[PDB]
């Protein structure tokens, strides 16, 4: 008889093959979308360069960075001595009537210029957590003494300059969360205002992060040729945007599983307990028109030849894609790939070119080799990798 | 001490006036958006015509109707005899691999061509409710024997041809709702797929409704010069899109309060019980870039000189705006305005040029003269109005 699980796969019940539910129709439209800059193997060197440029042109188009009639320059509003380093807090002015902030950790007795690492936090997290400090308000505080959280502090302890930014709507940029909701920031309401205005959450937060990157390129004590961007979880998204736009960034740390998000939205259709087909993520992740151009594997692939480390798996297919682009760029060895420990042995993975439809969140994570309870900044892989690439 | 209500109004706490919360910044961006085709009084006849054309060009741009390599023509799949009329069900094929449906009520013994009314239902509702029939599935059934619901049936009883359509994701176009959620259709997940693809829920459902309108213009028994579009609640949105795009539509029934939705999003900032500032409506209502061009009062104003009736209030300011456009078009008398009975006496209304910020849903509805428990299709105003305008 009736079985909700028999509705997991979306398909026509008509002899003519046509789809009647709007869900099915729009889902099919996504299945029928062939991204323009999907990476293809076997390109000539000229074709590769042109593809890489096309990816950048598409990113510029969809991110809609404004040209802002110059606002005042960034200003240091606080400096404190810590055990072995200095903590600076800076204000910057991205638009009229607006202010944003970032933190800078400088090693004590810094002589000549050293590598700088732009640290971008995860969902529910803040720059204070990244530098190992309590929250700006108590309800916004993270497990800041855990080295799995304090990415920026870890970087200053390696002798690098660490710059910690917030994600839009979170931390010091939050609204009423300090009174109740805490880490559960209302990113979506902010995203809606931006979307209404033709923009997006990622376009906005990336535009702000670009100003911090520009500030880092102007510091005499930061090696302009050794700027790294390290993103944890959500933070990998603005890192991708900055990396595509700025070819002079030296290296990248991608601390989230590498997701082919178009496929995910096509395959994750199994109804949940509420009899809904939840979208894989919220409008915080909506950049209109993105999938007409590319997916994350194509985007990160275009960062070639910059050294890049992936510390939390994804499908073998997508690692192969990135590896092929790196080979075409002439530095196949610059991209390094790791799986979650649970899936490090390929005997336990399913290496397929296409995922099956009818997945739910649990089965999708299983298919793409993700172990959510072990999601955290992989210092054990990143610190040694950076020691080697930054020489 | 602390009081949540003291956070209702968004404002700077800095001497330099700058805003730190992303909510406040993006909210200010909306406040600073000046729609390009906002209606202005005192335009020359040439300026008025050019403004009207500009509104249409902007609508075309933001609605992104596709050019579809011709699919098969609509097909009648069922015809039934009813008491005094015939009920026809039709299939149409808007895209490859897709099917949609509509219902047609024809008066019995129809001789020559008669006026046709395209009936567009409200949120949570269906074409079956509009024609006075039970749902396609039991959980989708409405109070279909209530004349306040059965708009289309009411129209056929007046001797007009009534054509009833669905809204995307609702009714026969629904997905899993017939098993549990019922009237609570997941419009938003459908909207997300469309938004990802550069489109929108309204762009989609309007594109489908345009095909039904095109079908009505081809029927020999429908007076091509007497096609009316009547929208209830949500249905007023596709009516606006079709009216702007097709100047040959004869008249409009706007059965929802006339909302200046940009202002609403700016003023409705009072935190709710969850300490959130809920957006006035969901992404079903997101058409990216709409507010860069216009608001609903400007859009309906551009329908001039077509006869139009507003049956459920709004601000006196916005009725004045529409009236001014109708005067400029040369038929000031073609636009007719009504308030909810509760607010019909201007002594109880507040006629202001700008609403105060810090409203919540309850206080906003109070400010704009809306009485939600009395929201329903106003036959008592519409039937007599149509009798007069359709002569």
From TrEMBL, chains A, B:
<protein>
    <recommendedName>
        <fullName>Abhydrolase family protein</fullName>
    </recommendedName>
</protein>
<dbReference type="Pfam" id="PF12715">
    <property type="entry name" value="Abhydrolase_7"/>
</dbReference>
<dbReference type="InterPro" id="IPR029058">
    <property type="entry name" value="AB_hydrolase_fold"/>
</dbReference>
<dbReference type="InterPro" id="IPR025890">
    <property type="entry name" value="Abhydrolase_bac"/>
</dbReference>
<keyword id="KW-0732">Signal</keyword>
